From Swiss-Prot, chain A:
One of its GO terms (biological process) is spliceosomal complex assembly. It comes from Homo sapiens. Its main location: nucleus. Residues 67-106 are annotated as: Interaction with SF3B14. The chain holds residues 463 to 1304 of 1304 of the full protein. HEAT repeats lie at residues 67-106, 107-141, 142-179, 181-215, 218-256, 301-339, 381-419, 548-586, 590-628, 660-698, 701-739. This is Splicing factor 3B subunit 1. The keyword Nucleus applies. The modification N6-acetyllysine is found at K92, K100. One of its GO terms (cellular component) is U2-type precatalytic spliceosome. Component of the 17S U2 SnRNP complex, a ribonucleoprotein complex that contains small nuclear RNA (snRNA) U2 and a number of specific proteins. Part of the SF3B subcomplex of the 17S U2 SnRNP complex. SF3B associates with the splicing subcomplex SF3A and a 12S RNA unit to form the U2 small nuclear ribonucleoproteins complex (U2 snRNP). Within the SF3B complex, interacts directly (via HEAT domain) with SF3B3, SF3B5, SF3B6 and (via HEAT domain) with PHF5A. The SF3B subcomplex interacts with U2AF2. Identified in the spliceosome C complex. The gene is SF3B1. One of its GO terms (molecular function) is RNA binding. Component of the 17S U2 SnRNP complex of the spliceosome, a large ribonucleoprotein complex that removes introns from transcribed pre-mRNAs. The 17S U2 SnRNP complex (1) directly participates in early spliceosome assembly and (2) mediates recognition of the intron branch site during pre-mRNA splicing by promoting the selection of the pre-mRNA branch-site adenosine, the nucleophile for the first step of splicing. Belongs to the SF3B1 family.
UniProtKB/Swiss-Prot annotation, chain C:
It comes from the Eukaryota. Belongs to the PHF5 family. Changing Y31 to E/S/A: Alters the structure of the presumed branchpoint (BP) adenosine binding pocket within the splicing factor SF3B complex which may lead to decreased binding affinity and thus affect pre-mRNA splicing. The record marks V12 as: Interaction with SF3B3. This is PHD finger-like domain-containing protein 5A. The keyword DNA repair does not apply. Zn(2+) 3 binds at C25, C28, C67, C70. Zn(2+) 2 binds at C18, C21, C53, C56. Zn(2+) 1 binds at C6, C41, C44, C80. It is found in: Nucleus; Nucleus speckle. Keywords: Acetylation, Activator, DNA-binding, Metal-binding, mRNA processing, mRNA splicing, Nucleus, Phosphoprotein, RNA-binding, Spliceosome, Transcription, Transcription regulation, Zinc. The chain holds residues 6 to 98 of 110 of the full protein. Residues 74-77 are annotated as: Interaction with SF3B3.
Curated annotation (Swiss-Prot), chain D:
It is found in: Nucleus. It comes from Homo sapiens. Belongs to the RSE1 family. Component of the 17S U2 SnRNP complex, a ribonucleoprotein complex that contains small nuclear RNA (snRNA) U2 and a number of specific proteins. Part of the SF3B subcomplex of the 17S U2 SnRNP complex. SF3B associates with the splicing subcomplex SF3A and a 12S RNA unit to form the U2 small nuclear ribonucleoproteins complex (U2 snRNP). Within the SF3B subcomplex, interacts directly with SF3B1 (via HEAT domain), SF3B5 and PHF5A. Identified in the spliceosome A complex; remains associated with the spliceosome throughout the splicing process. Component of the spliceosome B complex. The core of the protein consists of three beta-propeller domains. Residues 106-120, 146-169 are annotated as: Interaction with PHF5A, SF3B1 and SF3B5. The record marks G285, E307, E353 as: Interaction with SF3B5. Component of the 17S U2 SnRNP complex of the spliceosome, a large ribonucleoprotein complex that removes introns from transcribed pre-mRNAs. The 17S U2 SnRNP complex (1) directly participates in early spliceosome assembly and (2) mediates recognition of the intron branch site during pre-mRNA splicing by promoting the selection of the pre-mRNA branch-site adenosine, the nucleophile for the first step of splicing. The chain holds residues 1 to 401 of 1217 of the full protein. It comes from the Eukaryota. Residues 194-232 are annotated as: Interaction with SF3B1 and SF3B5. The gene is SF3B3. The modification Phosphoserine is found at S157. This is Splicing factor 3B subunit 3.
Curated annotation (Swiss-Prot), chain E:
Component of the 17S U2 SnRNP complex, a ribonucleoprotein complex that contains small nuclear RNA (snRNA) U2 and a number of specific proteins. Part of the SF3B subcomplex of the 17S U2 SnRNP complex. SF3B associates with the splicing subcomplex SF3A and a 12S RNA unit to form the U2 small nuclear ribonucleoproteins complex (U2 snRNP). Within the SF3B subcomplex, interacts directly with SF3B1 (via HEAT domain) and SF3B3. Component of the minor spliceosome, which splices U12-type introns. This is Splicing factor 3B subunit 5. GO terms for biological process: mRNA splicing, via spliceosome; positive regulation of DNA-templated transcription; regulation of DNA repair; regulation of RNA splicing; U2-type prespliceosome assembly. It comes from Homo sapiens (Human). One of its GO terms (cellular component) is U2 snRNP.
Amino acid sequence: NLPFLKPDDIQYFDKLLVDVDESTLSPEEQKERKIMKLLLKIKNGTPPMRKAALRQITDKAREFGAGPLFNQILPLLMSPTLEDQERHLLVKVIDRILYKLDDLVRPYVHKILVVIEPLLIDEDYYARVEGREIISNLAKAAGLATMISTMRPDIDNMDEYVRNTTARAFAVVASALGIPSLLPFLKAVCKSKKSWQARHTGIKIVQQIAILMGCAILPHLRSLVEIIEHGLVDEQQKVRTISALAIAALAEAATPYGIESFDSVLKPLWKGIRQHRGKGLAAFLKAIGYLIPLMDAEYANYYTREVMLILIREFQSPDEEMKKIVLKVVKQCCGTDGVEANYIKTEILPPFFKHFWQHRMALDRRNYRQLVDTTVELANKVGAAEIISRIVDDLKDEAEQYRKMVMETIEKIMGNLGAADIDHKLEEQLIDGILYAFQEQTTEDSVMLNGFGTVVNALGKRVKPYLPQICGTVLWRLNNKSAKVRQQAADLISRTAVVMKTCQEEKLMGHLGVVLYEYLGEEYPEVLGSILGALKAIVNVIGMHKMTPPIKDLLPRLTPILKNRHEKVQENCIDLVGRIADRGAEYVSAREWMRICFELLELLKAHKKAIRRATVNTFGYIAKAIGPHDVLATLLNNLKVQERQNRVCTTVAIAIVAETCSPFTVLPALMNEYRVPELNVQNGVLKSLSFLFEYIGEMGKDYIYAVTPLLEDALMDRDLVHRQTASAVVQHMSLGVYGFGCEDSLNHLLNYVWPNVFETSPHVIQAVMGALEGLRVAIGPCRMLQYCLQGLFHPARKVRDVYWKIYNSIYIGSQDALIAHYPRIYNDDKNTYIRYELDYIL
Amino acid sequence: NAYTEATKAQRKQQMAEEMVEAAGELAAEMAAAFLNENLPESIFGAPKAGNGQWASVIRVMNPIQGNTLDLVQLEQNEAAFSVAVCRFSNTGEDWYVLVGVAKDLILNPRSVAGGFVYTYKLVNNGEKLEFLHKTPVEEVPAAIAPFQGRVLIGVGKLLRVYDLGKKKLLRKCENKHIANYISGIQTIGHRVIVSDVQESFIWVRYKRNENQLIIFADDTYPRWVTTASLLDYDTVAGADKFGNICVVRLPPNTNDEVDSQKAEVIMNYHVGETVLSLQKTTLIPGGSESLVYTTLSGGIGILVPFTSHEDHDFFQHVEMHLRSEHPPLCGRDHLSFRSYYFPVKNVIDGDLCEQFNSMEPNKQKNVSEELDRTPPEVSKKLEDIRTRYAFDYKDD
Amino acid sequence: PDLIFCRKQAGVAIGRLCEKCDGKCVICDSYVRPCTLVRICDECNYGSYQGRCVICGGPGVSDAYYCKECTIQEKDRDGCPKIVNLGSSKTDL
Amino acid sequence: DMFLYNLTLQRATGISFAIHGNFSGTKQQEIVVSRGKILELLRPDPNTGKVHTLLTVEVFGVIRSLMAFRLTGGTKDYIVVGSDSGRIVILEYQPSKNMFEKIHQETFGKSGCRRIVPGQFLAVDPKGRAVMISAIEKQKLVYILNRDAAARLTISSPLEAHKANTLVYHVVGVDVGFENPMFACLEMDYEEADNDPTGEAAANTQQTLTFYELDLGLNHVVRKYSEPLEEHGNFLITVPGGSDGPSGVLICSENYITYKNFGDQPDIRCPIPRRRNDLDDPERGMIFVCSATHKTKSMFFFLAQTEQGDIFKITLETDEDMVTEIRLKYFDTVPVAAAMCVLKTGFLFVASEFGNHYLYQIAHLGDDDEEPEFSSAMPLEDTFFFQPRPLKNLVLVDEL
Amino acid sequence: QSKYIGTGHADTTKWEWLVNQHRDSYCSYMGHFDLLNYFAIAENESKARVRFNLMEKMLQPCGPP
Ligand SMILES: CC[C@H](O)[C@@H](C)[C@H]1O[C@@H]1C[C@H](C)/C=C/C=C(\C)[C@H]1OC(=O)C[C@H](O)CC[C@@](C)(O)[C@@H](OC(C)=O)/C=C/[C@@H]1C
Ligand SMILES: [Zn+2]
Ligand SMILES: [Zn+2]
Ligand SMILES: [Zn+2]
């Protein structure tokens, strides 16, 4: 039957809505209906229909011919309403039909490319990947000379578009058939005397071969370079520019190997540096920039000193592409190991910071990124202070964006190298420009925050003399009432608390502590979350007695915030409660801790994982401080009331208490709940036991004999679910105690799990199988094979199915281990069934 | 696949006789160079032939020097697999050398024509072997052990109590309920431990009144045993063809009168290299007893008992930490590797633990601080094991 | 309905998880001890499916992990664990 | 209670694998050996002629295959290890830290020395562009190796090359001159043998030398070529191709060696020479146990050792792009080795399959003397014969 | 499970089971080094020849059905 049709699919699958007998009306070449269904089964349909129709159209690919195939496929690939996945399917079927039709696709090659080549420039990266893919498969199906003869006339076309896409297509077929297969075509076209557009197109083929192939060029690098190197002295400026750009592309793809292949290109380039201007000089300089890192140390010194004059001259070019090119080249030169830092400090830095660090460069985002990253890469070689000093004074500029640029630059520099390079003067200059640049903020630039915290943490104990001033500015900023600056200041406190502890200014963190405490009534949730984060950051480093908001007063103020709906407030608040729980331990009523505990219990079901982790951890801390006895009784009471709908969180709580405090404390009670006659609570304690053992894992090695009888009577048939979840308990115990010497107890429970091997309900039988696999890893495949050998050749078939199934579970896992456990089976008349090698004795 | 020196000599001579047959008269010269030169078999390899051929030699060698005291070249197709030196209760203090031999052993497919047991006089205080008698037997005897003035010999799956006679070794008792084949046998003063080739160890008692070998225990698991040693009157430590080591122990309250006792396994551990010798011994004077084993790959290892549960928990936590912070190099799971055929039971991998010194300093700090210690303390506590049981030459 | 694992050869693509299924194991839905990183096949991690959740197919926010119980049983060593529906086509949500 | 504690005092001394190369990234050549459970890095000194153990590491697994490779333009050799894990690992030795850095580790199967899980066999493309790990039966995987801009090695997703009901005697990468990577392997299909109660399908079922090709442009692996062999072979030898020598493989077989490059190259065979007046039973065959390969910018040759420890120097005469004859020559005799390594500066490492290991110095290449040199074109029907002599081409320099 | 070689079912003959475990056993001999060492010591043959015989045994380890 036909699947669902979309409105845009009527244009391509209209002739299937009418039922006609195919044989009655079967004109030769009107069997398209056939392929139609297959195609309509691939685009719209389930995976089985797609694979079935796929294999059907690949087997009959020769019979159908390329004509109908592509004549019906290309319109679908051309439909504007085509989804990306549908297009992927059309690509795969295009490949799988191209593989069968080896030579038949030649007369249609052109008709394919005019439909496909646009995809090589589509905005969608995946569409470009698919276009390259099917062009490659087309280059393998048809011959090399077929693609060459098909795409050659478009080489010297007058339109730049078709030359560009043609060059990219030739790069694709170069990747499909290998560089050597297309080497002679490029050697011929790149020296064509017919027109310059041909040589330009071929050189573009070299460039796109560089970009596309990448590091796979290195073997053929000298071949391509020797094919292309002549274009640097041609009378046409366009072919010189594209030749230098393709040299730069080859150098980029060959990084960091392959300096020898560019040998015959080093001197021309250099020469051109003295006699070229405009964007051709930009291409030459770009090639030099991508070529210098490939060189050795001494030759990098020689060449860099040989081009640095013209480079410095072009530091002040009016063109923007020139400025960005020479900036990238500066980064590339000053990244090379051969360029000593003294030379850069003498001849490079003064014009660099004179001409490039202007106010007009901080406005363009591209100039921003290029200048900042280039400057940090300079700092990585010439030193931290040597760069920071030249831009510290600009931290006090009136233009805020310039302060953003220099602040980010110094932030990354000090984040990379550190503060050991900084003297006293540059230190005080840093704190000055950072304070001033942080005080007059029009918005809430995170760059100023990262810069402040980064420089403070970098100075470490060197910031102690400035902490009163810093905390004053942080307080004034904290009371600005622009809610986001209160948030930002709280974040800064949270980032610098650890350094404030190591500077002997605990009382200052006290003032910050009470000031932050007097802000928990905040309405804006994000700001409140930052406040709680700063409080948690101070509590962790300060002693519990030196907390200016005493915990006796602090915690009950945090208890109502746990009802906040925002996820950030919940996470930070819970985390603070847990820090007080683990470290503060006391100072709150056991009933108060309890109240907190049962406020937190629902938050185990939180949607965000971080909140779940925090809730688990703090619940563990408060369970350690309180003790298991009182809380466990209320959890056991909560297992019965509000059952099935909200008991899972109480189960997690029982496992948590069983972990932080030894399960010696809570397991006996859990036993007591099992006795009562009501059956659903039996399932409650069974489930809770499964999650308990799965959670504690290895701690259950000393608590198996205690739960053995419960799993004996429970595991022996009372209720179907009883045996289900009880087998689950056996599985979790087996996996948790695996490798801790409990083969006797688990081996004993095996004798009770095994009677339940024959069962029909899927859930309980899959639980039993899982228990058998856990007992396989914890007991060993030997015992499992022993239990499994009896019914492998049992006369009954219904037993052979189950025992063979178990044997499959034990064979897939630890197949190499079964070699030592296969029993001896004596050979009969027709066969030899004895492994004689294992009977050898030395 | 070997010739004895005599057989090699006859085939070389015969090959010279065939060699002269060619019409040619340089055949006698080629036979001069050929017969004169017996190439060194150590470097140019030993001539090998025959799927059923063998070569066995008994040697009496002094361990102080390298001299061989006596040499006994056996027959062509005789292959010795067991040997022992002991006294007999019926004779005086004369030392006798029993050697278990096999006749026409063909492996793959396994088929044996016969077996022999040579008896030697070992006179001149262990410097020469004098032929006494050669007692034939049906199956290959690969196990000979001194037992209460007599000799236990394991011929095939039949464990027999043998006494010395002036003409042949008289069969005094026999037990044929052994599963497959006897690879080795060791006896404490009263009991008998036999190593089945495939069915682990078996525990047999010898009733002196009737000369009856009653099987009173066996193992719950099959084990391709290679060697073993009795750690005490109840436990046995055994090796594995698949490179495993185990310790199996009888129930504490047991007597040899009861039957069908299931011996519980108290130790499992995959070494990773096939072990062929276990020995409980002290390595240095003043140290403690260790279970030294050798391996088929030319390696020497030791198993060492813990003195307290605190150390057990300590090294165990070390194992757990290094299993995650220092995982095996080739992607293998350490716990699964040591649980190759049987799950690990009460063994800590000290080779993994000593890699604590190879980790990064931050990982040493984390693992050490998790144990409330410092990295140098962990390293010293690791060296303590070698100081107590192995070789430590530090002199303060 | 009828959901099944991919079970093709996993590659270098790291499986992802959305905010709802941030801590589940792809195979047994267990939240305890996320252990080994999840690898998925190239076809299941392609185009519109890149970075999508392995369980429900939503926008992934973290990485997917097999639970420790699966790692012990070598359930990570099977095929790609991305849940696919044998009824929904590739355009369907 | 009885808790134990295992410790090793003398690590395993026998060698299961041995490869050589510039693992330190310098002009010095080192030897990585696998003792089974332990990976070890040794450095033979060209001065004193002693082998020193640079590094020794417990891998806590079963090492089943060991290979070294190098990317194009590289100066340092990596280490691919096929283990009993369901994972393949590429390692890099670090001299500054004296440790193997696990560069890559990709998972594909289950643990243990399994039958259909790859790890037993490992063959790498001689240009370093791809590696192939394969099992004894059915499953075969190929990873593509390519470095990034930071010159760090990167691995690809696995490409399947499975073939059901097929057994693999050996896998070997074929040296093609930067063409599509070629992995030649010996296969044997038992589907017919498993469905014939007469046993006649078991006989006459000969192994097939098959060439697998990695289509780098199409990113898939196809069973490109396959031809049955005359008699069963035990292992293959990579013949250097591209600019240095003709591409192809040397199939070692019981009593024969066969150069069988595919295309228009005719099969060239030569019988295994036997020692004069073998005291062995003539009914027993003779194979090679291992093979070393030395490649020079000028020439190349091979060293193939027999079961008796007979090392032969195998040279190939070539015309145009085809091979003419296989020239064997009796080199020397050493104990039966599990692996051999021919290093520059004239040294041969012989890791005996059992007993002590040896390190010799190459005094003469084996020629310029008056010993007989056998060729494949020599007619006979009867094998060649030679005289085993004491060591005259090698000198024992160290013994481990 | 059907696609995993060595897996069995109810209609699996004894010959199929023991040829499966025979091939598994031979592959394990190929893998574990010390096992192949023990075997190569028992029968005085080099490791290469023992592995060769173990590979020849893979065609029909037991016999025709
Ligand atoms: C009955 C069993 C079911 O799985 C049941 C719990 C599910 O129906 C509920 C549904 C709710 C939404 C699921 C809740 C899940 C949790 C509270 C888990 O936390 C996380 O994942 C968070 C983080 O990734 C790890 C935190 C940990 C290190 O503290 C972690 O510690 C350990 C030792 O594993 C805790 C894990 C617990 C269970
Ligand atoms: Zn999800
Ligand atoms: Zn997938
Ligand atoms: Zn799981």
